[PDB]
Amino acid sequence: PGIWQLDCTHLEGKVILVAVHVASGYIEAEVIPAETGQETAYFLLKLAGRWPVKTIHTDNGSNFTSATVKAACWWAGIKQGVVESMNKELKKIIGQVRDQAEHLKTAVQMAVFIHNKKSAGERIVDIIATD
Amino acid sequence: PGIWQLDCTHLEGKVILVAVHVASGYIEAEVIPAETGQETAYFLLKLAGRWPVKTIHTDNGSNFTSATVKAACWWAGIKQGVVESMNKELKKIIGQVRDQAEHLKTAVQMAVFIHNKKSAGERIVDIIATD
Ligand SMILES: Cc1c(-c2c([C@H](OC(C)(C)C)C(=O)O)n(C)c(=O)c3ccccc23)cc(F)c2c1CCCO2
Numbered sequence A, B: 001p002g003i004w005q006l007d008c009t010h011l012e013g014k015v016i017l018v019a020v021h022v023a024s025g026y027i028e029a030e031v032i033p034a035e036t037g038q039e040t041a042y043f044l045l046k047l048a049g050r051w052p053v054k055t056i057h058t059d060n061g062s063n064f065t066s067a068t069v070k071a072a073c074w075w076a077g078i079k080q081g082v083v084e085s086m087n088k089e090l091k092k093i094i095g096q097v098r099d100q101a102e103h104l105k106t107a108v109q110m111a112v113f114i115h116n117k118k119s120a121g122e123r124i125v126d127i128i129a130t131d
């Protein structure tokens, strides 16, 4: 309901931060300059401002040890194979549309759109609203 | 239902792109480096990937003339005093929390969170889900 999994993946020497709403498979993603606490914190603030984020999961717990990330979670009131499949599907879609944009970040957002419409977007709206 | 108003506002020599979902008052915002078509286009791709965006309104139509923006609207299938009040409320909240962060962008996302929880976030979930 309020559980999100956040992980970073690397592509073309850039870092893609991927958040998956576990119950629906819905994704939000950003291309970030480096895999740093400051970027993770800022991403969390944005995420928490639009969805009711209760709990964050990750495949790399050390991701969430910086004072900056701890601050974001404190302020927003957050605590610590669906996700694997959603990440798999996203990487595949990026591959499929990559040639249609100059910038990786553009391909990433095209892939997020395709994924969420193919839905995960309808399902998250349903879960948060009925809950 | 699918109508969003996008406008830029300037604060501390930076540019804040503010999108308001007209029916609910819900806001998404980003601090962007410059008031350019490339930034607007990228913002639209992200917005359209998470919400069902049908129509975009603005107080400055010239904002949406670049080939980049036209491309975003084409690809995502988008066409061209609530908004004034929501923008007013956002600027006020940024003012109120500004001293709590180093970076303006951080204050902006704190203000978006406060605004959406004070709700606009619950109402958009309701409108998109029942529609
Ligand atoms: C100050 C701060 C920080 C914080 C920052 C802020 O910048 C980020 C880009 C990391 C979000 C800021 O603008 O102040 N910075 C820059 C820090 O250096 C920092 C150090 C320790 C603890 C928090 C922060 C991080 C947060 F997630 C946060 C807050 C305030 C409440 C909302 O959540």
Ligand SMILES: Cc1c(-c2c([C@H](OC(C)(C)C)C(=O)O)n(C)c(=O)c3ccccc23)cc(F)c2c1CCCO2
Pocket (backbone or CB within 6 Å): A100, A101, A102, A103, A104, A106, A107, A110, B037, B038, B039, B041, B042, B045, B067, B068, B069, B071, B072, B073, B075
């Ligand atoms: C190529 C492109 C462009 C586009 C780009 C892209 O970069 C942005 C940062 C502007 C999103 C890109 O990565 O290719 N660029 C860089 C252009 O120079 C451009 C020029 C004319 C028309 C579209 C674009 C803009 C779009 F909104 C877009 C697309 C493809 C379909 C999805 O929507």
